[PDB]
Amino acid sequence: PSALTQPPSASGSLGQSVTISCTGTSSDVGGYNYVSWYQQHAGKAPKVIIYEVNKRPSGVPDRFSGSKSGNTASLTVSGLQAEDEADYYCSSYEGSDNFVFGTGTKVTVLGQPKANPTVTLFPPSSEELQANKATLVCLISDFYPGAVTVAWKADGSPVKAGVETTKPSKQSNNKYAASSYLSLTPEQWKSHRSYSCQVTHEGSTVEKTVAPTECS
Amino acid sequence: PSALTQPPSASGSLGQSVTISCTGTSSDVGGYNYVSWYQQHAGKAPKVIIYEVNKRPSGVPDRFSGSKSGNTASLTVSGLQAEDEADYYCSSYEGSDNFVFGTGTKVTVLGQPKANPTVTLFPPSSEELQANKATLVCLISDFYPGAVTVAWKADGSPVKAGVETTKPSKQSNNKYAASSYLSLTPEQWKSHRSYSCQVTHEGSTVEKTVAPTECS
């Protein structure tokens, strides 16, 4: 086990009751009537909340809740409070041994109207190809808040080989921007039908499918 | 709700070695010998690297470790891999099902070489001008260190504005990754002869070019 599923930006105003969740695969989360939550701030000392599936570490405000259903565990920040901007990580368990965390949520308390990505997938430049190089850039810009999820996938099948995802930038109008890239050969690029870039961000999940054409 | 201490930067020399402490109270660390360490990778998920004082996860490497003193507790890092640039937390136990971690230590790996930015200028996709848009992404990857400068030219004299930039992420190496984007309108893309993406980096500059002349 490595990762557990969690949303990118999970947010609202003060009053808004946010909910966050942490799905996995059939035991480890499930059967394991357990998980554990974690409040990251800036630096300020990454603390545990939600002990076992729900009990609190005493000091923690009653209005922090956690609960389970099948393979999904969920945190509820009932009545969002300003100083709640944080990152959230869930853990589980495996033998008298080791354990797994989710791909942490980030709770934004809204300033401005939301924005979910204007993704644009590029193909390789004739240069690149004539250099006998291959690379594809998923330009994910104009969001708020700053947590998007960047999946790539060749001919339907999820892929990894040489992907990267540049974490955010507060682009001059305050909104955000990020990047991601596949690095392949024209071996690799020429032998597939379609390639895509998929960008999740507050429910809205968008996708782009680029095909191989060789110019000439 | 205070710490367990770790110093603020445990600077090593790649190749060599470096250890890192955690100091707690008679209970929290002192008594319950369950201290652990979570290799938080700079913004990411933190994966535990020493559960329960000395016992090593199956998802971690050999040159890693921990030694329980009494109140202090330490990590043993030999053979300084460049991966091991990270922020590390220690954590212990006080009683009543609490766990309590300490600050973090930013272990810095000096000695890793300088790399130069692989500038990759792209042009608008067929399926972009189709919608009457033309953003231009400069890729700037695989460099070291992360002190870069990207400025865009039209063709001749500095053509800024539209340029909304990104701030170099660590890739999956310990090398940087930057994007740039200029946002044209086609009917302002044929009223130019070429386009530039200029990357300055530790003195070595690069300037790369897209001309309108593409199959696209």
Side-chain angles (χ1 to χ4, degrees), chain B residues 17-63:
Chain B
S17 183
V18 85
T19 65
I20 350 191
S21 333
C22 173
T23 301
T25 227
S26 274
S27 18
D28 41 85
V29 188
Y32 317 61
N33 290 174
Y34 308 112
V35 57
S36 316
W37 293 76
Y38 325 126
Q39 204 221 127
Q40 187 176 252
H41 253 160
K44 201 212 227 48
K47 40 205 145 44
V48 77
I49 76 187
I50 288 301
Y51 72 99
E52 182 180 288
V53 170
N54 78 234
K55 291 165 169 201
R56 166 149 277 80
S58 277
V60 136
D62 114 281
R63 307 265 31 90

Short mmCIF file of all heavy atoms in Angstrom, two decimals, chain B residues 17-63:
data_model
loop_
_atom_site.label_atom_id
_atom_site.label_comp_id
_atom_site.label_asym_id
_atom_site.label_seq_id
_atom_site.Cartn_x
_atom_site.Cartn_y
_atom_site.Cartn_z
N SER B 17 27.31 11.60 5.18
CA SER B 17 26.34 11.18 6.19
C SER B 17 25.76 12.37 6.96
O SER B 17 26.29 13.48 6.87
CB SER B 17 26.90 10.16 7.17
OG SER B 17 25.89 9.74 8.09
N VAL B 18 24.68 12.10 7.69
CA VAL B 18 24.00 13.08 8.53
C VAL B 18 22.84 12.48 9.33
O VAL B 18 21.96 11.74 8.85
CB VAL B 18 23.59 14.33 7.72
CG1 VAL B 18 22.26 14.16 7.01
CG2 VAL B 18 23.59 15.57 8.61
N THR B 19 22.84 12.84 10.59
CA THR B 19 21.86 12.35 11.59
C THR B 19 20.97 13.49 12.01
O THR B 19 21.28 14.66 11.65
CB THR B 19 22.65 11.62 12.73
OG1 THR B 19 23.47 12.63 13.40
CG2 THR B 19 23.55 10.49 12.17
N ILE B 20 19.85 13.20 12.65
CA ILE B 20 18.89 14.27 13.02
C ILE B 20 18.15 13.88 14.29
O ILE B 20 17.63 12.75 14.37
CB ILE B 20 17.92 14.61 11.84
CG1 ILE B 20 18.30 13.97 10.50
CG2 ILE B 20 17.80 16.16 11.67
CD1 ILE B 20 17.53 14.50 9.26
N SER B 21 18.03 14.80 15.23
CA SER B 21 17.41 14.52 16.53
C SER B 21 15.94 14.92 16.60
O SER B 21 15.35 15.55 15.71
CB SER B 21 18.21 15.22 17.63
OG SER B 21 19.57 15.35 17.20
N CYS B 22 15.35 14.54 17.70
CA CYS B 22 13.97 14.72 18.18
C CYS B 22 14.17 14.74 19.70
O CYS B 22 14.83 13.78 20.18
CB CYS B 22 13.13 13.57 17.70
SG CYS B 22 11.45 13.21 18.15
N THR B 23 13.77 15.76 20.42
CA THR B 23 13.90 15.79 21.89
C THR B 23 12.53 16.03 22.51
O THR B 23 11.89 17.03 22.16
CB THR B 23 14.93 16.87 22.39
OG1 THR B 23 16.22 16.53 21.79
CG2 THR B 23 15.01 16.96 23.92
N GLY B 24 12.13 15.13 23.41
CA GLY B 24 10.79 15.22 24.02
C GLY B 24 10.83 15.26 25.54
O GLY B 24 11.90 15.42 26.14
N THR B 25 9.65 15.12 26.15
CA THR B 25 9.48 15.09 27.61
C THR B 25 9.52 13.63 28.09
O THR B 25 9.27 12.70 27.31
CB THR B 25 8.14 15.80 28.03
OG1 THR B 25 8.43 16.71 29.16
CG2 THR B 25 7.01 14.85 28.43
N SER B 26 9.75 13.47 29.38
CA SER B 26 9.88 12.16 30.03
C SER B 26 8.86 11.14 29.54
O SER B 26 9.19 9.93 29.46
CB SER B 26 9.80 12.27 31.55
OG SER B 26 11.07 12.54 32.11
N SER B 27 7.66 11.61 29.27
CA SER B 27 6.60 10.76 28.68
C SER B 27 6.72 10.75 27.15
O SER B 27 6.98 9.71 26.52
CB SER B 27 5.24 11.26 29.14
OG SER B 27 5.35 12.61 29.63
N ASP B 28 6.58 11.95 26.61
CA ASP B 28 6.50 12.12 25.13
C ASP B 28 7.93 12.05 24.61
O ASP B 28 8.69 13.01 24.62
CB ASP B 28 5.65 13.28 24.72
CG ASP B 28 5.73 14.58 25.47
OD1 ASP B 28 6.61 15.42 25.17
OD2 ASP B 28 4.88 14.81 26.37
N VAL B 29 8.27 10.84 24.23
CA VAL B 29 9.53 10.32 23.76
C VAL B 29 10.08 9.40 24.91
O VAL B 29 10.11 8.18 24.80
CB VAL B 29 10.61 11.31 23.30
CG1 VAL B 29 11.81 10.57 22.66
CG2 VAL B 29 10.14 12.37 22.35
N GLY B 30 10.44 10.09 25.97
CA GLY B 30 11.07 9.58 27.15
C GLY B 30 10.74 8.15 27.50
O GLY B 30 11.62 7.26 27.47
N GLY B 31 9.48 7.91 27.84
CA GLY B 31 9.00 6.65 28.30
C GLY B 31 8.55 5.64 27.29
O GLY B 31 8.98 4.45 27.40
N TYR B 32 7.74 5.98 26.31
CA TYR B 32 6.96 4.97 25.57
C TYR B 32 7.63 4.39 24.35
O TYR B 32 6.95 3.66 23.56
CB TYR B 32 5.56 5.48 25.28
CG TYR B 32 4.81 6.21 26.36
CD1 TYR B 32 5.29 7.39 26.92
CD2 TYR B 32 3.55 5.76 26.77
CE1 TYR B 32 4.57 8.10 27.89
CE2 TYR B 32 2.81 6.45 27.73
CZ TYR B 32 3.33 7.62 28.29
OH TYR B 32 2.59 8.26 29.25
N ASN B 33 8.92 4.59 24.17
CA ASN B 33 9.67 4.16 22.99
C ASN B 33 8.81 3.74 21.79
O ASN B 33 9.02 2.60 21.31
CB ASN B 33 10.64 3.01 23.33
CG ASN B 33 11.84 3.36 24.17
OD1 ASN B 33 12.60 2.46 24.57
ND2 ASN B 33 12.05 4.64 24.45
N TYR B 34 7.92 4.59 21.32
CA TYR B 34 7.27 4.41 20.02
C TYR B 34 7.56 5.59 19.08
O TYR B 34 6.69 5.80 18.18
CB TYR B 34 5.77 4.25 20.04
CG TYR B 34 5.00 3.30 20.87
CD1 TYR B 34 4.18 3.78 21.92
CD2 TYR B 34 4.97 1.92 20.62
CE1 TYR B 34 3.41 2.92 22.70
CE2 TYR B 34 4.22 1.06 21.40
CZ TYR B 34 3.44 1.56 22.44
OH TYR B 34 2.70 0.68 23.19
N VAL B 35 8.62 6.34 19.26
CA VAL B 35 8.91 7.46 18.34
C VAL B 35 8.90 6.94 16.91
O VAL B 35 9.21 5.75 16.69
CB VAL B 35 10.20 8.19 18.74
CG1 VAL B 35 11.41 7.27 18.80
CG2 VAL B 35 10.49 9.38 17.83
N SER B 36 8.53 7.80 15.97
CA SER B 36 8.56 7.49 14.53
C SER B 36 8.95 8.73 13.72
O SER B 36 8.91 9.85 14.24
CB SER B 36 7.21 6.96 14.08
OG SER B 36 6.69 6.01 15.00
N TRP B 37 9.31 8.51 12.46
CA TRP B 37 9.75 9.61 11.56
C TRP B 37 9.04 9.58 10.21
O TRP B 37 9.02 8.52 9.56
CB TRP B 37 11.28 9.50 11.38
CG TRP B 37 12.04 9.77 12.63
CD1 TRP B 37 12.19 8.93 13.71
CD2 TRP B 37 12.76 10.96 12.95
NE1 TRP B 37 12.96 9.52 14.67
CE2 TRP B 37 13.32 10.77 14.23
CE3 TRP B 37 12.99 12.15 12.28
CZ2 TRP B 37 14.09 11.73 14.85
CZ3 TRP B 37 13.76 13.11 12.89
CH2 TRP B 37 14.30 12.91 14.16
N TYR B 38 8.50 10.72 9.78
CA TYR B 38 7.77 10.83 8.52
C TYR B 38 8.48 11.75 7.52
O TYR B 38 8.54 12.99 7.73
CB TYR B 38 6.32 11.30 8.68
CG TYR B 38 5.60 10.83 9.91
CD1 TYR B 38 4.99 11.77 10.75
CD2 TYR B 38 5.49 9.49 10.25
CE1 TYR B 38 4.33 11.37 11.90
CE2 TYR B 38 4.84 9.08 11.41
CZ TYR B 38 4.25 10.03 12.23
OH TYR B 38 3.58 9.70 13.36
N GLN B 39 8.94 11.10 6.45
CA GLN B 39 9.74 11.86 5.45
C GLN B 39 8.72 12.64 4.62
O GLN B 39 8.17 12.12 3.62
CB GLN B 39 10.64 10.97 4.63
CG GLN B 39 11.86 11.64 4.00
CD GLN B 39 12.12 11.17 2.59
OE1 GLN B 39 12.24 11.94 1.64
NE2 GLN B 39 12.19 9.85 2.42
N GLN B 40 8.44 13.86 5.11
CA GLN B 40 7.54 14.72 4.32
C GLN B 40 8.45 15.32 3.23
O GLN B 40 9.47 15.95 3.53
CB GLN B 40 6.76 15.79 5.02
CG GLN B 40 5.75 16.50 4.11
CD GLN B 40 4.89 17.52 4.80
OE1 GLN B 40 3.70 17.32 5.02
NE2 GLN B 40 5.48 18.66 5.15
N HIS B 41 8.03 14.99 2.03
CA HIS B 41 8.68 15.55 0.83
C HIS B 41 7.97 16.86 0.47
O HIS B 41 6.88 16.86 -0.08
CB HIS B 41 8.70 14.61 -0.38
CG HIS B 41 10.06 14.05 -0.65
ND1 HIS B 41 10.33 12.92 -1.38
CD2 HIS B 41 11.26 14.53 -0.23
CE1 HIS B 41 11.64 12.73 -1.40
NE2 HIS B 41 12.22 13.69 -0.70
N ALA B 42 8.60 17.94 0.88
CA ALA B 42 8.33 19.29 0.39
C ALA B 42 6.98 19.51 -0.24
O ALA B 42 6.86 19.52 -1.48
CB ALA B 42 9.45 19.63 -0.64
N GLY B 43 5.96 19.72 0.58
CA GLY B 43 4.58 19.91 0.13
C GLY B 43 3.73 18.67 -0.03
O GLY B 43 2.49 18.72 0.19
N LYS B 44 4.28 17.57 -0.44
CA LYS B 44 3.65 16.29 -0.70
C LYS B 44 3.15 15.55 0.53
O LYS B 44 3.07 16.07 1.66
CB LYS B 44 4.70 15.42 -1.42
CG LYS B 44 4.17 14.25 -2.23
CD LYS B 44 5.15 13.08 -2.24
CE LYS B 44 5.33 12.55 -3.65
NZ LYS B 44 5.57 13.70 -4.57
N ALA B 45 2.77 14.29 0.31
CA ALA B 45 2.52 13.26 1.31
C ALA B 45 3.81 12.77 1.98
O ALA B 45 4.83 12.53 1.31
CB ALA B 45 1.83 12.05 0.64
N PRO B 46 3.73 12.51 3.28
CA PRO B 46 4.85 12.29 4.16
C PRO B 46 5.41 10.93 4.47
O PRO B 46 6.34 10.87 5.34
CB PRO B 46 4.28 12.91 5.49
CG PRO B 46 2.89 12.32 5.48
CD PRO B 46 2.44 12.41 4.03
N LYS B 47 4.92 9.85 3.96
CA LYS B 47 5.42 8.49 4.11
C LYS B 47 6.36 8.22 5.27
O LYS B 47 7.50 8.75 5.33
CB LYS B 47 6.13 8.12 2.78
CG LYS B 47 6.92 9.30 2.22
CD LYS B 47 7.12 9.26 0.72
CE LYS B 47 7.11 10.65 0.11
NZ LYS B 47 7.89 11.61 0.92
N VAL B 48 5.94 7.35 6.20
CA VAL B 48 6.72 7.05 7.42
C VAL B 48 7.95 6.23 7.01
O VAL B 48 7.79 5.33 6.18
CB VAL B 48 5.95 6.33 8.52
CG1 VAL B 48 5.76 4.84 8.23
CG2 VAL B 48 6.66 6.48 9.87
N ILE B 49 9.06 6.55 7.63
CA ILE B 49 10.33 5.91 7.33
C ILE B 49 10.98 5.21 8.51
O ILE B 49 12.04 4.58 8.31
CB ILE B 49 11.32 6.96 6.67
CG1 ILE B 49 11.86 7.90 7.77
CG2 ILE B 49 10.65 7.70 5.49
CD1 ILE B 49 12.72 9.09 7.30
N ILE B 50 10.45 5.35 9.70
CA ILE B 50 10.88 4.62 10.90
C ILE B 50 9.64 4.55 11.82
O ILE B 50 9.23 5.62 12.33
CB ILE B 50 12.08 5.27 11.65
CG1 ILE B 50 13.41 5.13 10.89
CG2 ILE B 50 12.22 4.72 13.11
CD1 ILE B 50 13.87 3.69 10.59
N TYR B 51 9.09 3.35 11.90
CA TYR B 51 7.91 3.20 12.82
C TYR B 51 8.51 2.63 14.09
O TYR B 51 9.46 1.81 13.97
CB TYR B 51 6.79 2.39 12.16
CG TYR B 51 7.09 0.91 12.01
CD1 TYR B 51 6.57 -0.01 12.92
CD2 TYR B 51 7.93 0.44 11.01
CE1 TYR B 51 6.89 -1.36 12.84
CE2 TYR B 51 8.27 -0.91 10.91
CZ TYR B 51 7.74 -1.81 11.84
OH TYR B 51 8.04 -3.14 11.80
N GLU B 52 8.13 3.13 15.24
CA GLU B 52 8.46 2.42 16.51
C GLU B 52 9.97 2.24 16.67
O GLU B 52 10.62 1.19 16.46
CB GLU B 52 7.76 1.09 16.52
CG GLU B 52 7.85 0.14 17.70
CD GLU B 52 7.04 -1.13 17.46
OE1 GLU B 52 5.82 -1.15 17.49
OE2 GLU B 52 7.78 -2.09 17.21
N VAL B 53 10.56 3.36 17.05
CA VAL B 53 11.92 3.62 17.40
C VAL B 53 12.96 3.31 16.32
O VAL B 53 13.66 4.23 15.87
CB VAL B 53 12.30 2.97 18.75
CG1 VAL B 53 13.80 3.04 19.02
CG2 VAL B 53 11.53 3.61 19.89
N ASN B 54 13.08 2.03 16.03
CA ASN B 54 14.18 1.51 15.21
C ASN B 54 13.62 0.67 14.06
O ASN B 54 14.27 0.63 13.00
CB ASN B 54 15.20 0.74 16.07
CG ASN B 54 14.78 -0.66 16.47
OD1 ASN B 54 14.76 -1.02 17.67
ND2 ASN B 54 14.45 -1.52 15.50
N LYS B 55 12.48 0.02 14.32
CA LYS B 55 11.89 -0.84 13.26
C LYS B 55 11.54 -0.07 11.99
O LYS B 55 10.78 0.90 11.86
CB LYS B 55 10.72 -1.67 13.74
CG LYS B 55 11.12 -2.77 14.73
CD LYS B 55 9.92 -3.36 15.47
CE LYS B 55 10.28 -4.62 16.24
NZ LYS B 55 9.07 -5.44 16.53
N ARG B 56 12.14 -0.59 10.94
CA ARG B 56 12.12 -0.22 9.54
C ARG B 56 10.94 -0.82 8.78
O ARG B 56 10.72 -2.05 8.74
CB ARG B 56 13.46 -0.73 8.99
CG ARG B 56 13.78 -0.87 7.55
CD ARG B 56 15.27 -0.63 7.32
NE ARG B 56 15.50 0.80 7.23
CZ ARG B 56 15.59 1.63 8.26
NH1 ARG B 56 15.72 1.25 9.52
NH2 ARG B 56 15.40 2.94 8.02
N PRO B 57 10.14 0.06 8.17
CA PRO B 57 9.17 -0.30 7.14
C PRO B 57 9.79 -1.11 6.00
O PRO B 57 11.02 -1.06 5.77
CB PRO B 57 8.61 1.03 6.68
CG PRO B 57 8.83 1.97 7.82
CD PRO B 57 10.12 1.51 8.45
N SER B 58 8.94 -1.85 5.30
CA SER B 58 9.33 -2.58 4.09
C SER B 58 9.31 -1.66 2.87
O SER B 58 9.81 -2.04 1.78
CB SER B 58 8.46 -3.81 3.84
OG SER B 58 8.87 -4.95 4.58
N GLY B 59 8.73 -0.49 3.04
CA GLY B 59 8.67 0.55 2.01
C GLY B 59 9.73 1.62 2.14
O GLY B 59 9.56 2.73 1.56
N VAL B 60 10.82 1.30 2.82
CA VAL B 60 11.94 2.24 3.06
C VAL B 60 13.28 1.54 2.90
O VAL B 60 13.35 0.29 3.02
CB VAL B 60 11.66 2.89 4.44
CG1 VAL B 60 12.85 3.00 5.38
CG2 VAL B 60 11.01 4.26 4.24
N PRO B 61 14.35 2.31 2.65
CA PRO B 61 15.71 1.82 2.54
C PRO B 61 16.62 1.75 3.75
O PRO B 61 16.55 2.39 4.82
CB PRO B 61 16.34 2.69 1.43
CG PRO B 61 15.22 3.50 0.85
CD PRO B 61 14.21 3.65 1.99
N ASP B 62 17.70 0.97 3.54
CA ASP B 62 18.63 0.51 4.57
C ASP B 62 19.48 1.59 5.21
O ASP B 62 19.68 1.56 6.47
CB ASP B 62 19.44 -0.69 4.04
CG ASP B 62 20.92 -0.44 3.87
OD1 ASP B 62 21.37 0.17 2.89
OD2 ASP B 62 21.66 -0.90 4.78
N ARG B 63 20.01 2.52 4.46
CA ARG B 63 20.86 3.59 5.00
C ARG B 63 20.09 4.52 5.93
O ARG B 63 20.69 5.52 6.45
CB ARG B 63 21.57 4.31 3.86
CG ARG B 63 22.33 3.33 2.93
CD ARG B 63 23.77 3.17 3.29
NE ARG B 63 24.02 3.31 4.70
CZ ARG B 63 24.00 2.35 5.61
NH1 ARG B 63 23.90 1.07 5.24
NH2 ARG B 63 24.11 2.66 6.91
#
